[PDB]
Every structure is written in structure tokens, then in C-alpha cells.
């Protein structure tokens, strides 16, 4: 119980990488907040977590909504008693061309990926700052390289990134940890969201035939980056399947 | 001489700063040059002035923020001036100051016309640069390169415009469509008198008071330079620094 | 015990993270060779980790020596059966401005840090292809960020991590991981060494205020990435002082 | 006439690049230094230089010789008064898997691509101090982008940028220009050299349909650089064919 009496907030933790990530900390002994849009699924992850002895906060929360963000971690604080570690996590990956793109794919990806994690970066900032705790960046592959159909998900993702090393330059002096973590193709929900039909198709046929990072996986590697002694600030962990060139 | 003569240039930015320069050089080159910003005041005595010098000139006034006005825009553009050729993605903020307590409309603001207005604007055009074999010229920055304190925001924003049109190239480049980034490092223009973080606006002009900036000029000629290169060859990034400054 | 059977081999393992790493292993149950130039002080740890219950095979090896890489990696597979974690920790960092450099400063990081780094690849990669194995390379913050007075170092290090994700490319649909360690300021021996008396000084001032990385916790990042599912390949692991903007 | 009254000294001036860059130069006024080991091809350039008004000096050097390095920039110097421009273009490109390399290949690489410029750099350095001038760097897309089968040209040319990034840090405040020249697949003899055949016949068939760059195209890259104005340092370019993703 590495993380005991510690509270970790955690967006988009209704399924994938999110929800193992909610479980490996409540499983190290950390107070867990889950946010998400689709309460009914924190509700349940919910029950199944307190059932197993964990303390936990259910925020139905929308990222991009500033207000909503500056509420979630006002409810996080007060439930739990503090904040230790945020896990930006919530995210959304529309693939398909520029050309005569669905614009909504932009603006949401921009709303949720980059502002909103800018949002609850800076909201949470305060109470990081007085626990001398840890932020984590949930980034990709997509903020490291650069691939065909993914482009306005790339640039969301290089610029999580680019904010997170500055905001690391800014806070890290003060005992804030800022961890950003890279993975390559994970098996979730993520991609039953792509709007671009040829391009969901291609996406699904080019990664077929690899054995997929798991959300498990993925959940570990924030859990030895938050683990680490304070003096330590794991800045960047990039896990790629081995299966993938 | 007369390197792009017949070629049309649609540049954003064009009221002030380098994208006033490059209008300006390109103009001087020959390309008929549609001039867009929100000061149309500074439009109508840019595009005078090219005018009076012999040049084709479309005033636009646009907010690169505003979807519609970019779709707009670039109609007006191809119907004033018969196609397009060259468009300049130049229009831009710079709203320094730290993460913590930040005014997020710093950060919507950049978001707006740094990322979304440059895509929006991307994306209108290209159909036309289709059929022309066109070029399309990214302005980022050295913050697209190098991140430093109290930039958070615009260093995620040029950083984004950088991978955007490194994967814009991958998608385009084989049907004849240039992608060039130009990456100026500090450059003596309008920009930083936007900064609304007072402690940081007065921390970053004392520290480029100390070198020889980079002058609009010297940027025009980078973005000359890139389009004036032959067919075959795409400039993709010209990152140019003051020579003063470490 | 994740590593009981696997046999690691560990170049630099006479100090700071090498020692670290070998100790971290061979606690997980891997058999170790550890190598190095100093023999009297891999004896010493060798006896240490004897005495623990590990295996240990002794190499006295200069990683510049192209015949003497070869030949450590056949006695270690005559010695320990074979080669499942090679990591090429072994390096030297001599700082100090490019102008009127001593050049040997650049022959001796060149030979240790690439070519040598380089050599010990090729050679394992036979037995690490038959293990379906994991190369572990010790790179720096020096591989990802550059900074005055390091100019040969840094060309080493991102001609290292250049090097490696290439190899990652050639050789992880074959089931080869490649891993990348990027330490920053950790306490170990390495400043020791450096020759331009002036920029010794200047490092070590630059240094003076902070929480250093512990040889012990670059130990831990290699544990982690080693001990990860082998459809994951951790490729980069950026391990900062929290203290250090 | 942008260059009059200015020396430059080209390194691997005996074809290709090198060659176009001494005549670009020349053509802009510089007197111009011309290095390469093939004397022969040297003269010849230097005659049809001459005899289009330039001041030519021939150098026969390899840069992979620290000795011949020194000698050649004291020679340059006594001849034609000074060293305004150092472009460092001398490499070679030896393709080919990691595993079972011929490792002369690497060498080969190291002391040419990697050595051979930095041995050049500090060479000309205080020469340039003096005349507040410019190093033109040539590196490549193999400095910005991995490929398979290109692992160690990849190395050395991820080493010079680092190299020339840090070098800049450290020589920009005193006036010297540091300029990294990056191009993508050029029509020169650079492909001729590599050694492994199946390699090679593989990457001649890679760029068998694009429009190659010219080297004319990379000595107007350097050209522009070397012309802008002294507070300005074009510190990269980077340029493909438009043909090749
Ligand atoms: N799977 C993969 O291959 C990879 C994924 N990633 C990143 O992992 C992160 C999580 O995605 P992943 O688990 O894969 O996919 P999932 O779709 O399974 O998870 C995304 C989570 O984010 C939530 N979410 C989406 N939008 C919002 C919003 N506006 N406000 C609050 N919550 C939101 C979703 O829940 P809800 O609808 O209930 O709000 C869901 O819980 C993303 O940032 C993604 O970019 C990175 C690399 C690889
Ligand atoms: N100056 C510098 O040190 C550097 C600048 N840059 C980049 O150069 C580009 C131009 O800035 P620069 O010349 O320096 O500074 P300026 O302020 O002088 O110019 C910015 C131009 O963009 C226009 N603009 C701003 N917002 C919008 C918008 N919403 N819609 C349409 N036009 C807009 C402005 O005119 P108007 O108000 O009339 O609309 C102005 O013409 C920016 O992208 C900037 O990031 C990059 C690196 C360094
Ligand atoms: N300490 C730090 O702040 C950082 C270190 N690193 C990297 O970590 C690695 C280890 O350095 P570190 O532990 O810090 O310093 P140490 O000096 O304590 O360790 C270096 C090890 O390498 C060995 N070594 C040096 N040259 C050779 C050679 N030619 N052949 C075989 N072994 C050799 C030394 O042993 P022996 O003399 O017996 O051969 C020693 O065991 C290096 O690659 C370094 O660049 C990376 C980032 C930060
Ligand atoms: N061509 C391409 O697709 C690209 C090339 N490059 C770079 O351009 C540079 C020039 O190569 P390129 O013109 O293409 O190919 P070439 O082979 O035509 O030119 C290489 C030049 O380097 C010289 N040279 C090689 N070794 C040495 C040495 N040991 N000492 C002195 N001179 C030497 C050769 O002359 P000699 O044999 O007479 O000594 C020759 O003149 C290289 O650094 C290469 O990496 C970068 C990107 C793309």
C-alpha cells in the first residue's frame, strides 16, 4: 500500500486505461475520484472498488467545461480531504484526413485533449502545490510521432506534451511532479469513436495483428511513476507494443 | 525579376508584423496577394500602398477564429484573383505568463487563432492548392521547438501547428502540396504587446531588449526563400534565430 | 523472482547506476555478469551478490575492445547458458567547451558511449533474438536536451538514442525490446572523470543545490521496464530531479 | 557579389553537394578553400572556379585526420587571409541491418560524419571567432528521422545536430553563426558507397519514382543561410522532395 491515506483524482475513468488506472491506485491504498461523463459506468466502477474497500468520490464531469472543472476538484477536495495525484486522463481520438474534414472532430478533440486538460491542470494546481503532489499527463504515441489520418490528434497531443514540460519548468521547484505518459495502441473504447469510416477501418485493419498494449499495462507505468521517491519526477514513460514497428 | 509572377498569395496577419513583410515580398515578387487581418484600417493602407507600387491586392477582414469567415474568405479570394497558390497561415498570439492562476482567456484566445484558424484556414485552402500544386507556409515558431517558463499555452499551440503540418505533408505531399514551417525565434514586431500577464510581459521585454531581434524582413525572406524553391523540393522547416540570443 | 532463470549481462557494473542495476537483478532472481575495467571492485560486488544467492560471471571487458565484446558475450553464454537482458551502461562524461577541446576527451566518449555501446549490441543480439530478449541502454537527459559545455556528450547520447529506436525498428517484430534509460543528474562516480578543470568546477557548482537521482532509482526504472509483459516494450523511461528545472 | 572579400572552406567540395556549395560560394564572390581526399576532381574544380574569377585553394585532406584537419586550416589561412565560412560536408552513408554488420562500416561513419566535423569545427573556430563568421553543418533528414537500415548514419547525424546545438549555445554570443543544413534524398554518389548489397539495391529502388533533390537545391539552402543578414542565425533547414512521404 504504497499510496496509503493519499487521494488521487482521476478524468475519464469510466473505461480503459482510466478505469485500470483508478484501480491500480485505489489497489495501492490511495482515496480515488473518478470522473467522467457517463455516470452509470463510475457508479458501478464505483461500487466495485468500495465493495473491495476503497474510498471513493464519483464526479460526473466534463473536462472542457472550466466551471465544471473548477466544481470537480472543489467536490474532490472536500469529500477526500485533499489532492495528491491528478491523472489527466480523459481523451478522444477522431481519425481522418484534412481535407474536408468534420471540423467538430477538431474542436472536440481541441476541447477535451488539450484545453481540458489545461483546465484541471490548473484547478488542481493549487492543492498540488500545498500536498507537493503529482500531476499525470495521460499523452500518446500521437505527441511523440507523427502518422498519416492524425493529425489534429497529433497536434492535441504534441501540445499536452509542450504544456507539460513547461509546466513542469514552472512548478517542479515547488515539489509538484509533472509525469507524462506516451502510450502506443492500447485495447479500450478509444477507437469506436473515429467519425472518418475509411479511416476507422484502416485504423482497425492496421492494428489487427499486433498482441495491444493492455489498459493494465498502461495503469503500471503510472503506478511506478507515482511511486517513485518525491525527489524523482519520471517526466516521460513511452511504452510501445513490441509487436509494432 | 518576378520569381512568382501570376501566382496568387493569400496571407494571413497581413495588418502588422511579418505578415504585413511577406505580403509586401511576396507582391514584390509578382504574386497577387489577398491581405487578411481584423484592422482593416491597416488592410486598406497596406493594400494602397502595394496597389500604388503596381500590385493586385483583395482586402479581407477576418477573424481566422471564425469557421465561416475563413470559408468566406478564401472564396473571395479565388474569385477576386482566379485561384490560389501561395496561402500564409501568419495570423497569431502570444499571451506569455505562468500555468498557475492563469486568465484562460490567454489560452482560448491562442488556441483559437494559433491552432484552430490556422487549421480552418489550412483546410479551406487546400482544395485550391490541390489543383494548383500549391504551398502552403505554416508560421510557428521557436516555441514550436523549444519550450521555456511562462509560455505553457503557446508552446503547446506552435508545438501542435508543427505535428499538424508534419502529418498535413505526410497526407498531401505526393499530389504536388508544399507544407514549409518557418520557426522565427524572437523578432522585432506587435506581438508582445498583446501579453496580459503584466510580471511576465515586463520579464520578457527586458529580456529581449538585450539582443538584435530578428526583423520581419528578415522572416519574409525565409517564407521567399521556401516558396521560390523549385517544385521537387519542399522547404518543410526553416527555424532562423537571433544570432545574440542563446 | 520475475527474473528467476533469465540471465542478465551488465556493462559498467563497477559503480553507480551499473552496480545499482546488477544489485536490482539479481534481487529479482537473474543470473548476472557483470563488466567493467576495474576487476578488485566487480569482485567485490560480485562476492556480495555470491553471498545473496545470485550466479555471477565476472567480465573484465573494455567496451572500446570490438574483440573483447565478442568474447564477453560467447563466456557468458558458455557461463550462464545463454542472454536474455543486456544493459549497456557503461559511459564516461567529459565536459567542457568545443573550443580548443582535448580531443582525446572526444575519442575516449565516442569509443565508450557509442562504438562500445554499439559493439555489445551486435554482439548480443544473436542469443538476444533466440531469448526473445531485452536491451536496456543507458542514455541521459543529455540524449534529450542540450546544454553548454556538453557538446560531445550530447552527441553521443542522441547518436544512442537515434541508434536504438532504429534497432527497435529492425528488431522488435522478432520479439527483441529495446529500452532507453534517460537519467538526469544522478550521484554517482561519473563527474569524477571530467578533465577540463574549469567546467568540473562550474558543473559541480550547478549541481550543488539539489536532490540528486540515486544510482538506486535508475535501478528501479530498468527493473521496471525489464520486468514489463513482453508484449510491451518501455522505450523510453525520462527519469528527472524534481528539484532541477 | 553578396560574399566579396569573404573565405569559405568546403569539406567534401571533390562532388556532390560539396561541389555545388564551392561553386554557389565562389559565385557570390568568396574566395573558396576546396577539401577532399580526391585530389584530382579537386583541381579540376578549382581550375573551372578560376577560371570563373574566383580565388581557389586546394586542399587534399582527410577529415577523419585531426593532424591533416589543423594543417589544412593554417593552410587556408596563410593562402587567403582568413576563414569567414566553414562548411563541413564531408560524410559518407553506409546502409545496412544492425545485426551482423560489417562494423568498419560504423567506423568508417564515426570518424568521417561524426570526428571529422568536430575536428573541423574546432579547428576553424578561432578563426571565425575572429571574423564573426558562419559553420554550415551538413547533416540530414537522418539527423530528424529514423529508418531502418540506417541506424548508425543516423546516430552520427542526430550527434551532429546535437553537437551544432550545443556549439551554438556556446560561440552564437561572439558573433559565430552556427547553420544546420538538412536535406532528404539528393542525386549524388553518396548512394555508390554503401556496402551492403541488399541493402543497397533496396534503397535505390525506394527512391527509383520521386524527383530527387538537386545539389544545386542544397547548395542554394546554404547560399540563403550563409547571405542572411548577421543577427540572423538560420540554424535549420530542412528539405525533402515533395515526391517522397
Ligand atoms: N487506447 C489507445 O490506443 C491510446 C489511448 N491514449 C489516451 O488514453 C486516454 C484515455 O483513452 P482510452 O482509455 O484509450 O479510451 P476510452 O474511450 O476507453 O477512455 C476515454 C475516457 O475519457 C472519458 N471522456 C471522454 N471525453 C470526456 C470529457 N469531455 N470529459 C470527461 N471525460 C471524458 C470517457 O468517458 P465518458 O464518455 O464517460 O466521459 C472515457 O472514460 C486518452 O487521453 C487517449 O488519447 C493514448 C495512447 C494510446
Ligand atoms: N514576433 C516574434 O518574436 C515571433 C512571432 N511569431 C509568429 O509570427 C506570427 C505573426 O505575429 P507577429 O508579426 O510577430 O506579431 P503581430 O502582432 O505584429 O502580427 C500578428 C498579426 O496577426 C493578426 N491577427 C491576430 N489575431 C488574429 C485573428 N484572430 N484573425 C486574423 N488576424 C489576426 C494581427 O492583426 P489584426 O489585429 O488586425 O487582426 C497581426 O496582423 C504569429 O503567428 C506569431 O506567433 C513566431 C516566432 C517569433
Ligand atoms: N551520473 C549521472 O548524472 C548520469 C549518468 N548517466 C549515464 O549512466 C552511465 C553510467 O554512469 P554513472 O554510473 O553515472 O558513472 P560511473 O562512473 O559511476 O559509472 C560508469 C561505469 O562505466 C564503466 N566504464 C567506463 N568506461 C568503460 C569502458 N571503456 N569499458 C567498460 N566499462 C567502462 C566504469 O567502470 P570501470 O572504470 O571499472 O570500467 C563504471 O563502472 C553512463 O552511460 C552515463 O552516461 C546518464 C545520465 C546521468
Ligand atoms: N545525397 C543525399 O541523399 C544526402 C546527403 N547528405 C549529406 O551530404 C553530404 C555530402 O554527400 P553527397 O554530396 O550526397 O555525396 P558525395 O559522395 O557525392 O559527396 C561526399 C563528399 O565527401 C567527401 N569525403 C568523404 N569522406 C571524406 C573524408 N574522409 N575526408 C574528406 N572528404 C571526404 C567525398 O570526396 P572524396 O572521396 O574525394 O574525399 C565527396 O566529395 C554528406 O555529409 C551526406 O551525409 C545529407 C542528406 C541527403
Same mark, same amino acid.
Given at each position: 500500500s504504497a499510496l496509503q491515506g493519499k487521494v488521487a483524482l482521476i478524468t @475519464?475513468?469510466?473505461?480503459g486505461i482510466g478505469e485500470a488506472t483508478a484501480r491500480a491506485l485505489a489497489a495501492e491504498g490511495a482515496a480515488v475520484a473518478i470522473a467522467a461523463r457517463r455516470v452509470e459506468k463510475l457508479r458501478a466502477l464505483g461500487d466495485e472498488l468500495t465493495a473491495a474497500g476503497a474510498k471513493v468520490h464519483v464526479l460526473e464531469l466534463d473536462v472542457a467545461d472550466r466551471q465544471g472543472v473548477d466544481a470537480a476538484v472543489a467536490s474532490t477536495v472536500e469529500a477526500? @480531504? @485533499?489532492?495528491?495525484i491528478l491523472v489527466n486522463n480523459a481523451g478522444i481520438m477522431l481519425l481522418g %484526413?484534412?481535407?474536408?474534414?468534420?471540423?467538430t472532430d477538431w474542436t472536440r478533440m481541441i476541447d477535451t485533449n488539450l484545453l481540458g486538460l489545461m483546465y484541471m491542470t490548473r484547478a488542481a494546481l493549487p492543492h498540488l502545490l500545498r500536498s507537493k503532489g503529482t500531476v499525470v499527463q495521460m499523452s500518446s504515441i500521437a505527441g511523440r510521432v507523427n502518422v498519416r489520418n492524425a493529425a489534429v490528434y497529433q497536434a492535441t497531443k504534441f501540445g499536452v506534451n509542450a504544456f507539460s514540460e513547461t509546466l513542469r519548468q514552472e512548478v517542479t521547484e515547488r515539489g509538484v511532479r509533472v509525469v507524462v505518459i506516451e502510450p502506443g *495502441?492500447?485495447?479500450?473504447?478509444?477507437?469506436? &469513436?473515429?467519425? &472518418?469510416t475509411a479511416t476507422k477501418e484502416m485504423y482497425e485493419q492496421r492494428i489487427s495483428q499486433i498482441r495491444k498494449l493492455q489498459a493494465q499495462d498502461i495503469a503500471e507505468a503510472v503506478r511506478y511513476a507515482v511511486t517513485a %521517491? &518525491? &525527489?524523482? *519526477?519520471?517526466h516521460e514513460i513511452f511504452i510501445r507494443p513490441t509487436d509494432q514497428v
Open positions: @475519464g475513468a469510466s473505461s477526500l @480531504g @485533499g489532492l495528491d %484526413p484534412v481535407e474536408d474534414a468534420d471540423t *495502441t492500447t485495447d479500450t473504447e478509444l477507437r469506436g &469513436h473515429i467519425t &472518418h %521517491p &518525491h &525527489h524523482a *519526477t519520471v
